[PDB]
Structure formats: structure tokens, C-alpha cells
Amino acid sequence: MPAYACQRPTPLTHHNTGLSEALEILAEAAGFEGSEGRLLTFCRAASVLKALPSPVTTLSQLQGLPHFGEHSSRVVQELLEHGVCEEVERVRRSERYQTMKLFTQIFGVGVKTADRWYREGLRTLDDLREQPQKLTQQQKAGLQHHQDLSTPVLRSDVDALQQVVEEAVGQALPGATVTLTGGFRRGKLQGHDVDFLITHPKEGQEAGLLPRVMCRLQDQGLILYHQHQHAFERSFCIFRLPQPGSWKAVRVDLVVAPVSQFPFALLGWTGSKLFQRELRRFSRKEKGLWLNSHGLFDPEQKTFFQAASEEDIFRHLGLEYLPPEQRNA
Numbered sequence: 001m002p003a004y005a006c007q008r009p010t011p012l013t014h015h016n017t018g019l020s021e022a023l024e025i026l027a028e029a030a031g032f033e034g035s036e037g038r039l040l041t042f043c044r045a046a047s048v049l050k051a052l053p054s055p056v057t058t059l060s061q062l063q064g065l066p067h068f069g070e071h072s073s074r075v076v077q078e079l080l081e082h083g084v085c086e087e088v089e090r091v092r093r094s095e096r097y098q099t100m101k102l103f104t105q106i107f108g109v110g111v112k113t114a115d116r117w118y119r120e121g122l123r124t125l126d127d128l129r130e131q132p133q134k135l136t137q138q139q140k141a142g143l144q145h146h147q148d149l150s151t152p153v154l155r156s157d158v159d160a161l162q163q164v165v166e167e168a169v170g171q172a173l174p175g176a177t178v179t180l181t182g183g184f185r186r187g188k189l190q191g192h193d194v195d196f197l198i199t200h201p202k203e204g205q206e207a208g209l210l211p212r213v214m215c216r217l218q219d220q221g222l223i224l225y226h227q228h229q230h231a232f233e234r235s236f237c238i239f240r241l242p243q244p245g246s247w248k249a250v251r252v253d254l255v256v257a258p259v260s261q262f263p264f265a266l267l268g269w270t271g272s273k274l275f276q277r278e279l280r281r282f283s284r285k286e287k288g289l290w291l292n293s294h295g296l297f298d299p300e301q302k303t304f305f306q307a308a309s310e311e312d313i314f315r316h317l318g319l320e321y322l323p324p325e326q327r328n329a
């Protein structure tokens, strides 16, 4: 099995979910403590298990796998022998981890904000609501809707949202396209948000499209929150999704890219986050090119690669093409 996650298929469903879940708790906890090296190490080990064709029943099956050092091996050994890993259970039970998870899950809260709040003695959602001067407007909106935003977004929600976004995009600008990206493009059945990439086949015709889209959605009562950012033009939103007898707040990211950059933006926004990190590391370390959501830059020659498709980018980097459902690293 090759070293980089971008050199191997990682399907949606696999045979090692208990083990990968435990390593990913340790990765997340590492990130909460600012231990970025350890985060990446645990994330990589978990992603190896996701790519295996069979369940790991005994530790022999570890043999020959890259990115499976002593610590990750130890964790798996304890799970196989004892059905539980004490380091993992202590993390689960810890107030620090529980609170960092609570806070960072809220819309508009990252690790540094969550850690600051923790160090200042804040622990609960009510504690945050008692200190509104400490909150950004985005965070206030995340708190207002936290129950719905903690509820997994379903494929059925995605289909309804794609319909209203497509309708608004179509009415504002005939010819403009909407592409579902993120985890749902990778085949996921559930998610934390819905990601859309908007473009138009004529370069420049995408200008000013997003505010017209947003006006249309707002006048239908579909928007609870939006923050328009002029990097790609993007609106990070909370939609009010109608449902039978009720409604549901749902996070939606709308990203506009000029068509020349579309393949790079689709690649970046499709993920997984680890897949894309690995693809960028591969591009730099193995091919000496700098990949991002806007392009593929050769820093020696000072050149940008022209791509019409994701397949072009994979081909140019000397990688076998992986469709989005095999990017679940």
C-alpha cells in the first residue's frame, strides 16, 4: 500500500471503523492542544486502516503498512486485546476534550478561540450566551442554531438545497452552473454542511452573481445567516430548510470560481481534508509543484498549469485518477 493517501483508493465504507475512530479521537485531541505533528501522524494511520480490504483482527495484519509507528500500533494492540484503549477513554472522559469539542463544533469557532474560552473558564453553551460581547455575529448565529447544526445533514436535505440553489443561480444568470462538492460529492450519506461550487462557462460572467443569488434566496425566506466574503468569492450561510411540519437550520457554503480555476477549486473543495493535504504534500515533495484551490504553480519556471478537469491535474502530477468516492482518506 503506497505512502500517500492520494496514491490509493479510500472508499466510503470500510472494515476498521472502531480502530480508525479511536485513532481519530487521538488526532483531534492533539489538534486541540496545538500538537499539529501528532494530529497528522494519527490521521495518516487512521487513513491506512480505511484503505485496508479486510478487518484487522490480530496485530500481525499491521505488518508492512506505512505511517504505522509505535504509538498508533500500541493503540490498536490495546483495542484488539482488551476491547478498549485507556489513553483513548481518558481523552473521551476529559473535560478539556469535551469542552474543546463542544466549542469547536459551533459555527465560526476554531481551535484558538475555543482554547481561549477554555483558559478563561468557559465550559458550556450557556456560559457563552452569558458573554455575548465575547462572540462574533457568526458565532451568535451558530449558538442560536446549535441543535440543528449538530444534527447530521442528510442526502434528502442536500437534494432540496441543491434545487433551491440551482433555481436561484438559474434565474439570476442563465448558463451558470452549480456543482455539489464536499463530502456529499464523495458519496457520504451525511455531513456537517453542504458545499456548492458555482461558475459560468464564459470567464468573468460569474462577477456579481453571488449577491444576486443571495438576494433571491433571502426573499424566499431561506436564509438565516450569511456572511459574504469578497480567495474566491464565497458566502458561508445558514439556510432555513423547510421540512414536513417543521424546518431545520443547515450550514451551506457557496463558493464562486472563475471557470479557468474551476478544476482546481472542485479538487480542493471535494476533499477529504486529509486527501487534499496529502495531494498538496505529494505535489510539492514528489513533483516540486505547488497545488492549491486556484492552480498548480511551478515555482522554478514561474508557470501555472492549464487544466480543464480534475483528470488533467492528476495526470499532470503523475497520479492515477481517483474518482471522488475513492478520496475518503
Ligand SMILES: O=c1ccn([C@@H]2O[C@H](COP(=O)(O)OP(=O)(O)OP(=O)(O)O)[C@@H](O)[C@H]2O)c(=O)[nH]1
Pocket (backbone or CB within 6 Å): 181, 182, 183, 184, 188, 190, 191, 192, 193, 194, 195, 268, 269, 270, 271, 272, 273, 276, 293
Ligand atoms: O474554507 C474552506 C473550507 C473547506 N475547504 C475544503 O473543502 C472541503 C470540504 O470541507 P468540509 O469542511 O465541508 O468537509 P467535508 O464536506 O469533507 O465533511 P462534512 O461536511 O461531511 O463534515 C475540504 O477538502 C476542505 O479542506 C476549503 O478549502 N476551504
Ligand SMILES: [Mn+2]
Pocket (backbone or CB within 6 Å): 182, 183, 184, 191, 192, 193, 194, 195
Ligand atoms: Mn462539507
Ligand SMILES: [Mn+2]
Pocket (backbone or CB within 6 Å): 182, 193, 194, 195, 253
Ligand atoms: Mn463546508
